[PDB]
Curated annotation (Swiss-Prot):
It comes from Homo sapiens. This is Peptidyl-prolyl cis-trans isomerase NIMA-interacting 1. Peptidyl-prolyl cis/trans isomerase (PPIase) that binds to and isomerizes specific phosphorylated Ser/Thr-Pro (pSer/Thr-Pro) motifs. By inducing conformational changes in a subset of phosphorylated proteins, acts as a molecular switch in multiple cellular processes. Displays a preference for acidic residues located N-terminally to the proline bond to be isomerized. Regulates mitosis presumably by interacting with NIMA and attenuating its mitosis-promoting activity. Down-regulates kinase activity of BTK. Phosphorylation at Ser-53 by DAPK1 results in inhibition of its catalytic activity, nuclear localization, and its ability to induce centrosome amplification, chromosome instability and cell transformation. Ser-53 is dephosphorylated upon IL33-stimulation of dendritic cells. The WW domain is required for the interaction with STIL and KIF20B. Changing K45A: Loss of peptidyl-prolyl cis/trans isomerase activity. No effect on the interaction with IRAK3/IRAK-M. Abolishes IL33-mediated increase of IRAK3/IRAK-M protein levels. CDD domains: WW. Its EC number is 5.2.1.8.
Length: 145
């Protein structure tokens, strides 16, 4: 299979599903290099973040495990269609790019933290990552171009 993708088996149900270890995406359907990609993201910061402060909150005190729970609820809502990505990003992302629906503009390799970079370049146009961990906190990344 395509890059980072391994087949796995559901604990709840027993059907196979696919997992991507670079992006942390998982999906049921079988899955399916650019100089540049364009991504949006939703960042949730925690107490061990490189900069534990955001436009949302002067001192970020939530723990990493609590940050991960928030990320997972936003991923559930985005995948069920209850909320869309841009709207959760605008309200709840700890990055100042929240003001632009999460949009970061296009970027190439060499520019982002490697785990964010690697995730962005492994996603396909249109695809969303699972929780992606960097020194900033925890990201959900949407590749738009
Ligand atoms: O300080 C931080 O740690 C931070 N890191 C980021 C970020 C942006 C693009 C890709 C990955 C992380 N945004 C912020 C921020 O507060 O606004």
């Amino acid at each position: 299979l395509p890059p980072g993708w391994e087949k796995a088996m559901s604990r709840s149900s027993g059907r196979v599903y696919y997992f991507n270890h670079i992006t942390n995406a998982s999906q049921w359907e079988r899955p399916s290099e650019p100089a540049r990609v364009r991504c949006s993201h939703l960042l949730v910061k925690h107490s061990q973040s490189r900069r534990p402060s955001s436009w949302r909150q002067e001192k970020i005190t939530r723990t990493k495990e609590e940050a991960l729970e928030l990320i997972n609820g936003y991923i559930q809502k985005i995948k069920s269609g209850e909320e869309d990505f841009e709207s959760l990003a605008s309200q709840f992302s700890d990055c100042s790019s929240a003001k632009a629906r999460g949009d970061l503009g296009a970027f190439s390799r060499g520019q982002m933290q490697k785990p964010f970079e690697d995730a962005s370049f492994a996603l396909r146009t249109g695809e969303m990552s699972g929780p992606v961990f960097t020194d900033s906190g925890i990201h959900i990344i949407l590749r738009t171009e």
